[PDB]
Amino acid sequence: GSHMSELSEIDSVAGVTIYSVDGEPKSFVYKAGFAIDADGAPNAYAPNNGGTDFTANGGDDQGGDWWGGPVDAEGYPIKQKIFDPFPGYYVSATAHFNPAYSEDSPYRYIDSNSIPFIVLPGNHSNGAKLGDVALVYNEKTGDNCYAIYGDVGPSSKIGEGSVRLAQALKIDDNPKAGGTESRIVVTLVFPGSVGKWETPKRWFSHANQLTKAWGGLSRLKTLSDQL
């Protein structure tokens, strides 16, 4: 156990209070549910409901409003090539991206299947920039994982992250029926910590260094009981 933390409200979304954690390093925290964001997974979306998510959860794939990823000049989703992970599936995008790759490439986006990432609500980043790191904890399983701020969600919803983060937290990772509405996940974000794409080894190390400086899981576990 650790001492309790001193908390100062900075925001509120969907009945979830977001608190700055007084002290250094600078951080904010919230306790929320955990919806599955399959964005960036190269098998999330395909024609005829072929992906791990239903196609329509990315929008209309017949030239209408498609938000799941990039589109061609006639508005249809880009299909992956023979050198992409899932040829013929659609390219699924995340807000955070790797500039080494082109807009039409799955490799530009953060693969939800492999990378632990959190989503923050649009207009509710609270000073965090895409690529910043976080420590995430599930109070019902005792599991934790470092993660990046990797995607942007609806402004009216909070508590969401990647397939791999769900696995690490022992939350059902299925895009179609997984996640949880129970407010069991505590997310500690370090705004200003990275703010760019870098290798997972590098950002994970930086998350580890910030977490050690901040007081570790022991402090976050105690903090969770305050939320």
Numbering used by the authors: -2 to 224
Give the authors' words:
We focus on AMGs that potentially encode chitosanase enzymes that metabolize chitin – a common carbon polymer. Our rigorous analyses not only resulted in a crystal structure of a soil viral AMG product, but also enabled us to propose the mode of action of this previously uncharacterized chitosanase enzyme in the GH75 family of glycosyl hydrolases.
The apo1 structure was solved by single anomalous diffraction (SAD) methods using the signal from bromide ions soaked into crystals of the apo1 form. A single V-Csn molecule was located in the apo1 asymmetric unit. The N-terminal part of Domain-1 (residues 1-36) is folded first and the polypeptide then folds the entire Domain-2 (residues 37-108) before crossing back to complete Domain-1 (residues 109-224). Inspection of the apo1 structure shows that the two residues identified as putative active site residues (D148 and E157) are located in a cleft between the two structural domains. Two additional acidic residues (D34 and D36) are also located in this cleft adjacent to D148, and these residues were also conserved in the other GH75 chitosanases. In V-Csn, the side chain of D148 makes hydrogen bonding interactions with the main chain amide nitrogen of A92 and the side chains of both D34 and D36.
